[PDB]
Symmetry: D2
Subunit: 315 residues, 4 copies
């Protein structure tokens, strides 16, 4: 009334799961855009039939034309590469995707500016904290209308691994990972809760040890690598994390979700994007929340921002 | 496969909303039992038609016969009175319901013992922390198979009021109220979080003040009174809280939910029921969680248990 | 984005269930309006707390002021009486509600015209086929923006009773009841299907007999009477039927649902409202579907319209 | 209570979407089994993290060991090949998959018989009407405990294409395709309804023509080919169709769904599996529904069964 229009700029693995979940949730009409001929039309057709099983009514259409961005309410950008040519799975690193994806953001930004300047934008392409700011600058959208994927996905892993050890519902574990999405991500032990209760209480009771937590932290940071080596660059959880973000915006839920956003003095940083809890609703990024970090935690945050800055320079 | 059987012992205001929500969620077959002739059959019939609108397949039937408890998987007890004869709305107090509801629990316990000794039991009738233990003793069920409603409902109010002030999604506020359901309920300021973040951070930032919180605490304790005076003994939120508990059991969610349970040394107390976080799954009460309270917080907990003990003596 | 505003003009039994279901489905902000002081504020408060259990974010507020209609996207009218003073339960008839509810529609129509002329309106108050046209004329809204409750509720009963006999999922039975909501409702045996298959096939196979169907038809027509005598004027299924209608409009589902709508030559009738399948989406009543009735079926339809005309004259 | 165990025998494209949808719906614990080393463990890990976003609690684990079938409640078989080596996309035919998949069913049947003889089985591998009977014979399960995918998927396409032309909710179109899943599938024009109304009424009103329907029928039969040529052997709708079937069994919905089942005289056929409407609930295939086909329709059904028989002979 009237349905939102959601344009998926990139119709690969993450794009396909996102289209599926949108139909399941009846969130809006979908366009699967890509540079590859024919493929998005085929995925769209397959996905469109699920409206019957789902009791939904969302159109799903394919596109090879940039001007189909016209009228978009939400734009989700996964366009680019997942690995660098020559690299083995063992040496997979998000940093190596910098030279491959830079110009793709510039091109997409020009089309957004021309076709849908009032859309809400979610950037996924890696390295995400660099790419999101590049797209912000080239699309011209307000700072409250663009974010990057990172923390919702990283914390889903940390939350899940802890919930399995303690035998509680996964969503009952809450946790914060900040700064950047990548190997310098900052995992904040002090801000973990289980059922709203400080995790330290469960450590005091010998229900989970400090050593067990250290191993879970290392597993969290290396999850994408672990999967890439067993199967492929992950796509199912990434997709689910992006849809939780888009849903909060579309339905005005005002959920607190950790995403990459423009910093204007928080943590001592300006003129750069970084991961922090934000509130997402009808007005986009409605609130940027600054965690009251200690000096040891701030020092790790600074390390993460330094890495985004280094790659920003090379783009 | 095969559907669970859920017997609502009491088919009044809370019973009706529970039957409605069960059909909405397709949770199982429902029996609305009551001593009043004809009424439960009428409510059951009305409710049964919603299977069509809901795409569900749950039977809903009325009953005036105790032996329909046979085969029950979950039994939810709301039977009793909501106010004491002679009392004005202004002097409404849960304690005054003690003489009115005592024998009703004994009678129901004998029927459970005979008809469905392996069922999971949820007690609602007031004063709840007294009635639940009375039913435990007369039904003979194991301590992991019976709980009382309190904390899920009380914290929903505290969580909601804070979420409105801060403009975030209601379920993003987490909070703990313990000891007993009633005027001595213990509201734990130290264990409030917003998006997993300590509420004290939002107080430090002047987003919510200490004085505003004190007013919200008083409102929480007096909510039932506030509504009773405007309309009636509350029924919609109570119903929703009970169904969240029953759902966690039926689907093995393992949610951490604050409920009245048998204490065996936690907080220094034994041989009595009191409100504390528990884990609810396929095996019933799978874990009893003891909050590591300070001495000031323990002193308030002791006051709440003393009140349950006082009424236990008068029953 | 931004949430719809849904004003419930009337906060009694049906109003309360509607507010509950809206929060469960996260459909929009709710206003419970009524002439009774204090009561809607109490129901609103109780209902608002369920946002926590439901993972929703819908405001629920009470009102005793007509100008709170300002900005409404959907208006649902249940205001009026459910029984006539002096009548016994046994002699309960919707026709007797004509003198009691006539002026209430005129008053509400003037407030809609002034405050929210672009809202979508659903009328429930009895006798519904008369009241809906009265409100259409006094509110000034376009014919595609107002409908009355009838067929979704009446067919839910017929569909349910047949599904129980044949042991299939309730929503798998489809059926049509047309003309008017009341004792002259027209039940169309020829248009019943089970799993998309003509019901006559199941009759040929002795899975259900013609005599069994006649008894089910009589039960359908007399359901409200059956419940009224056991309990009260029904409210849970009515509420669920209204929300299915409002949901189809809000989410642009384009469901085919039988409702009371302005006839402009269909079935040979003009200048009156009557029950027929319609398509509900973003544009309101998007299509009015005319069943290709035979002469025997048309004769019954004519009887139903004659009754609406008779009462229209007495209003 | 306790959760169902669902073993996906085959962890390729359809297996991955099924695991995702199971977690979304909280249907049960999942095992992704496959002969490929490492891959199912990687997909399982990725998928497991979505429990957080979904508010679910389903384990998802990978397997390369047949004995992990032990304790299975539902077994879903997609193991095999999707295309024949040497064939171009243009000459893709399900019949060519007969020599490639025959022994795989025999092997899996022996493991089911040994490990989970009381499980409910859904067969997907092509040619499906042949493979399902082969697995029935080698697994030893009762005829009410095994079915094949076909009609739910084929009719989703027909239902969807018609709903787009008429502009109504997709699930409001009902339709029957029977006999076999493949190029001889039987599309029954006489059994199409829209909102429970005979499609012929919409043809009489010039809302859709006979010629338009012929083109939609041809598109339905050739959909898999259309997609295969644009992208790949379809996987998203197939997955959704299988989960609707498994869900009806697990939750005792008793939905009428068209599937491949053992015929014992229906349509004049015995000792073979073929597509027809069935009722799926707690007891498996609870009812086999025989459509009262005319002689022209029966002649097409006979053509479809002849093809299954021909390939059965070559296996
Ligand atoms: N930020 C995060 O937490 C995560 C980020 N990522 C990143 O997301 C991206 C997508 O991953 P997948 O979907 O698995 O990759 P994928 O390779 O399956 O899909 C990417 C698609 O982009 C298309 N493409 C290239 N240029 C385009 C253009 N100009 N316009 C539209 N489409 C274009 C390609 O043809 C391809 O279909 C990668 O860069 C990955 O590193 C992935 C997971 C998580
Ligand atoms: N524990 C908690 O957080 C809360 C507890 N309560 C308590 O729940 C109870 C129910 O409240 P409502 O449903 O609003 O009251 P209600 O008065 O509308 O319904 C109670 C029903 O119990 C029936 N009943 C009496 N004896 C019975 C018996 N032997 N077997 C079966 N039914 C019997 C009555 O006829 C009546 O229909 C009250 O005691 C209330 O104080 C209410 C809200 C919250
Ligand atoms: N069309 C249908 O298929 C059905 C129609 N109905 C009709 O719906 C109506 C409502 O039924 P219930 O909710 O059970 O009745 P109810 O009596 O519980 O509630 C009606 C409310 O309207 C209020 N009211 C009176 N004048 C008003 C005004 N000017 N503005 C706002 N509120 C006003 C009353 O104070 C009362 O709270 C009845 O007329 C009933 O006959 C009921 C069921 C089905
Ligand atoms: N019945 C129907 O309506 C439809 C049937 N189909 C059929 O479903 C099958 C699966 O299709 P997709 O998932 O797209 O194919 P896919 O090729 O992506 O996956 C099949 C998987 O089976 C595995 N496999 C081989 N032998 C196995 C064994 N002994 N045990 C366990 N796994 C084994 C392979 O390694 C592969 O991962 C195909 O035969 C296809 O033709 C596909 C769609 C619809
Ligand atoms: O973290 C992940 O899962 C990722 C997969 O591809 N790029 C990533 O960053
Ligand atoms: O807290 C409430 O809402 C209650 C209503 O009736 N008894 C109660 O305890
Ligand atoms: O049909 C029903 O259920 C009704 C209840 O109150 N008025 C009605 O028409
Ligand atoms: O019908 C389809 O979609 C199919 C895909 O792979 N085999 C099939 O039969």
């Amino acid at each position: 009334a009237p349905k939102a229009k959601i344009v998926l700029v990139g119709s690969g693995m993450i794009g396909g799961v996102m289209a599926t979940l949108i139909v399941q949730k009846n969130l809006g009409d979908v366009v699967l855009f890509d540079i590859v001929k024919n493929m998005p039309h085929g995925k769209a057709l397959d996905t469109s039939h699920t409206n019957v099983m789902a009791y939904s009514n969302c159109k799903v259409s394919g596109s090879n034309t940039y001007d189909d961005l016209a009228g978009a309410d939400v734009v989700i950008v996964t366009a680019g590469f997942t690995k660098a040519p020559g690299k083995s799975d063992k040496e997979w690193n998000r940093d190596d995707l910098l030279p491959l994806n830079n110009k793709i953001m510039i091109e997409i930004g020009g089309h957004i500016k021309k076709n849908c300047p009032n859309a809400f934008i979610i950037v996924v392409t890696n390295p995400v904290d660099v790419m999101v700011q590049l797209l912000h600058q080239h699309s011209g959208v307000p700072k409250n209308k663009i974010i990057g994927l990172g923390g919702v996905l990283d914390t889903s892993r940390l939350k899940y691994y802890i919930s399995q050890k303690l035998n509680v519902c996964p969503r009952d574990v809450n946790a914060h990972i900040v700064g950047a999405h990548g190997n310098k991500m900052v995992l904040l032990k002090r801000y973990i809760t289980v059922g709203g209760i400080p995790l330290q209480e469960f450590i005091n009771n010998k229900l989970i040890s400090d050593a067990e937590l250290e191993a879970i932290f290392d597993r969290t940071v290396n999850t994408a690598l672990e999967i890439v080596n067993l199967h492929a660059s992950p796509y199912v959880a990434p997709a689910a994390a992006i849809i939780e973000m888009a849903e909060s915006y579309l339905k005005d839920l005002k959920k607190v979700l950790i995403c990459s956003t423009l910093l204007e003095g928080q943590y001592g940083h300006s003129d750069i994007f970084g991961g922090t809890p934000v509130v997402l609703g009808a007005n986009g990024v409605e609130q940027v929340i600054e965690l009251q970090l200690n000096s040891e935690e701030k020092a790790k945050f600074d390390e993460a921002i330094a890495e985004t800055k280094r790659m920003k320079a090379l783009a």
